[PDB]
Chain A
Amino acid sequence: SHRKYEAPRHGHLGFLPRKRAASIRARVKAFPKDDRSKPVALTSFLGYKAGMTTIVRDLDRPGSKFHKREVVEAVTVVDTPPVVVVGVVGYVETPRGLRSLTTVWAEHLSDEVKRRFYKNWYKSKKKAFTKYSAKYAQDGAGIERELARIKKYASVVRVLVHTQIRKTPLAQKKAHLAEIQLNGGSISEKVDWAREHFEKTVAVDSVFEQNEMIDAIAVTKGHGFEGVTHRWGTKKLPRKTHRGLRKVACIGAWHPAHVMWSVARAGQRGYHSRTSINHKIYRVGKGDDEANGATSFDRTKKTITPMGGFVHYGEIKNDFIMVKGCIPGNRKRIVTLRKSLYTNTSRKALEEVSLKWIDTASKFGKGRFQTPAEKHAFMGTLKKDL
């Protein structure tokens, strides 16, 4: 017999299986289509999710009730110290997909990135890329020839980079190393761009510009085993039900004599690789200057970390990025910022955003002051002050 009353199915079937992601760092499944007219540029960056704040901006859109009016928006602050380029890999296209031809690396590898290749680094001889560096120190004994191979073949070249998490305030000390595709010029231009950038750092101000809709790729916050009621949002069973009410009542008809793949079941919630799109860049801030949170309307000497530090993260002494809204993953998590795979207009991507005031009150409670100067100016003299 048919469903007595229609209702949409609970949950998106296109996000299955709701299992734990294979790694804490989410990879970029797809990179932007390459051009040749455009110059060689990285198409992604790696940063760390620090926390969220609030901003006030003078919204302008011709036809809304809030035209030329102040709006309060949640923003996510991503701590993004410059990533170090160490290596490049060429991919040749084959009738079975892209296949990696070879990976050329850099003469000297930082101990932070070299720590990635170990699971017990302290109790090791640190023998890592030693023979590779021995192959180095000569002109092209095994380096220029491999780069020539990558130029002659390998329709796709991706630069291997790693994060500067000694600069980041985490307890990690193990650099996240990933691949960023280069999407400009020819293969020769991409390869010698990588070679020239070997052992060198690149900052976000080169990759991402202000007022840019980028994509965020991250592993969402994990929550362990969850029941169907919170994992899929199915309706709670009535109060008077033997054997529990946080269940799905009927998990299938008699025939087919199996539980279908589309019935809601309990299992792992969260910790999934997700790529969300169209997140606007609100500010590309630099740590190598004070007054990160100073706007042309505030003009107050003030960094971006709130009073008491970002909760569970700390300080943003590096470069950083203000993404509007929320992004997948929790704080302290490595996120990947990616260029958009299409050029949207929407009268929303080409909206010129200029912040008026960004909140730095303490997120560790109901914060009242933005600066300790403001706190002192309000309270006055305290007994702790002599």
Chain B
Amino acid sequence: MKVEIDSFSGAKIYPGRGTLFVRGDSKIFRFQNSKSASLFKQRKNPRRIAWTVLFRKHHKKGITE
């Protein structure tokens, strides 16, 4: 058992939960749930969605780990 990371929200994907998506370029995208999957499919930026790990890292909030 190894845990996956959301390709949009950077969240921890535990087995069975979430979804997998393969693009035409064979780029595998893993989503924790329908929220991340749907926001991805409407072509939104994780850097511009406020609650995402990418947004957190870009705005430098919570980098003490």
User: Do A's and B's CB atoms come within 8 Å in the complex?
Assistant: yes
Q: A residues touching B (Cβ–Cβ < 8 Å)?
A: 54, 56, 70, 72, 297, 356-357, 359, 361, 366-370, 374, 378, 380
Listed in ascending order, the chain B residues whose CB lies under 8 Å from chain A are: 1, 11-12, 14-17, 32-35, 62, 64-65
For A366, give the chain B residue with the smallest CB separation.
Answer: B33
A361-B14 contact given A56-B1, A356-B1, A368-B32, CB 8 Å threshold: yes
> Are the CB atoms of A72 and B35 closer together than 8 Å?
no
Contact of B17 among A70, A366, A378 (CB under 8 A): A366
| A72 lies within 8 A of B12 (CB) | no
B57: shortest Cβ distance to chain A, in Å?
13
Chain A proximity of B53: nearest CB distance (Å): 9
CB distance from A69 to the nearest CB of B (A): 11
Q: Contacts A56-B1, A380-B62, A380-B64; is A366 near B15 (CB within 8 Å)?
A: no
CB pair A368 B12 closer than 8 Å: yes
How far apart are the CA atoms of A370 and B3 in the complex, in Å?
Answer: 12
CA distance A367 to B34 in the complex (A): 12
Asked whether A370 and B33 contact (CB < 8 A) given A297-B1, A357-B1, the answer is no
Chain A hits for B64, CB < 8 A: 380
- Contact between A56 and B15 (Cβ–Cβ < 8 Å)? yes
Please measure, in the bound complex, the distance between the C-alpha atom of A367 and the C-alpha atom of B16, giving whole angstroms: 12
For residue A70, which residues in chain B have a CB less than 8 angstroms away from its CB? 1, 15
Query: Do the beta carbons of A369 and B12 come within 8 Å of each other?
Result: yes
Indicate if the CB atoms of A366 and B1 lie closer than 8 Å: no
Question: Closest CB-CB distance, A382 to chain B, in whole Å?
Answer: 10
Q: Do B12 and A378 have beta carbons less than 8 Å apart?
A: yes
Min C-beta distance of B3 to chain A, whole Å: 10
Q: Which residues on the A side are within 8 Å of B11 (C-beta)?
A: 368
Smallest CB-CB separation from B11: which chain A residue? A368
Q: List 29 A-B contacts (CB under 8 A).
A: A54-B15, A54-B16, A56-B1, A56-B15, A70-B1, A70-B15, A72-B15, A72-B16, A297-B1, A356-B1, A357-B1, A357-B15, A359-B14, A359-B15, A359-B16, A361-B17, A366-B32, A366-B33, A366-B34, A366-B35, A367-B17, A368-B12, A368-B14, A368-B32, A370-B14, A374-B12, A378-B12, A380-B62, A380-B64
Query: What B residues does A56 contact at CB under 8 A?
Result: 1, 15
A361 vs B16: C-alpha distance when bound (angstroms) = 12
Compute how far the CA of A56 lies from the CA of B3 in the bound complex, rounded to whole angstroms: 12
User: Whole-angstrom distance from the CB of B54 to the nearest CB of chain A?
Assistant: 15
**Given the complex of chains A and B, what is the CA–CA distance between A297 and B15 in angstroms?**
15
- B33 / chain A contacts, CB cutoff of 8 Å: 366
Min C-beta distance of A319 to chain B, whole Å: 26
